[PDB]
């Protein structure tokens, strides 16, 4: 059935040195809303703690006429996979691979992220990110499987500068799509995401919200 509780363990490297976080979260699979909390389980990150935003669970997420695709594959329990591929303005990538397993309307998340290319005088090895805009995903479905996610992304520095990346995701369902989903291409989301983060320690919210051109 419909999420309500979550976990998370996100852990990896990021320009060559290891990370490690877990934590809970709640969210509403009705309105899109989700909450996390996540702590260190080795000691201080050397990098913003916003650079792991967004990548910190689309079963949250409904659609204007029921279940998302996601939401749908975890009630069911065929479930998805998820790679996600963002490019950042000053030549830094960053990969993600999720994994989920679903305990009545209890999700735990497996993230593994590999981060490099950061210049060690940018905005997130010196932690100078403070926000992030706003931000419209639009999601196709090129076959029944799979589904595909871009979007621009921005944070905010320091001195009110932007600091940018575009992004690609990549859904793989076990079992094929509802050709409910197939007649209405694409899908938009609208999102934004708030962090407060010690060095160890982060509690992160997002609002989403699926429309069409309709």
């Known amino acids: ?18 990370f490690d976080m877990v934590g809970q979260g709640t969210g509403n699979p009705n309105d899109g809303y ?9 000691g201080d990150l050397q990098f913003s703690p916003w650079i792991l935003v967004p990548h910190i669970f689309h079963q949250y997420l409904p659609y204007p006429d029921g279940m998302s695709p996601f939401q749908a594959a975890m009630v069911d329990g065929s479930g998805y996979q998820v790679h996600r591929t963002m490019q950042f303005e000053d030549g830094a990538s960053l990969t993600v691979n999720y994994r989920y397993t679903y305990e009545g ?3 735990k998340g497996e ?3 590999k981060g490099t290319g950061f210049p060690a005088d940018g905005p997130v090895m010196t932690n100078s990110l403070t926000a992030a805009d706003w931000c419209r995903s639009k999601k196709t479905y090129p076959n029944d499987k799979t589904i595909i996610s871009t979007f621009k992304w921005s944070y905010t520095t320091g001195n ?9 995701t990549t859904y793989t369902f076990a079992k094929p799509m509802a050709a409910n989903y197939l007649k209405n291409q694409p ?3 609208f999102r934004k995401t708030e962090l407060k983060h010690s060095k160890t320690e982060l509690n992160f919210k997002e609002w989403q919200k699926a429309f069409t051109d309709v």
């Open 187 to 189: 899908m938009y989301v």
């Open 105 to 107: 309307s209890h999700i």
């Open 111 to 113: 993230a593994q992220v």
């Open 1 to 18: 059935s419909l999420p309500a509780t979550h976990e998370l363990h996100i852990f990896g490297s990021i320009n060559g040195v290891d």
């Open 34 to 42: 989700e909450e996390l909390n996540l702590k260190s389980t080795k």
């Open 160 to 168: 009110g500068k932007r600091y940018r990346s575009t992004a690609r």
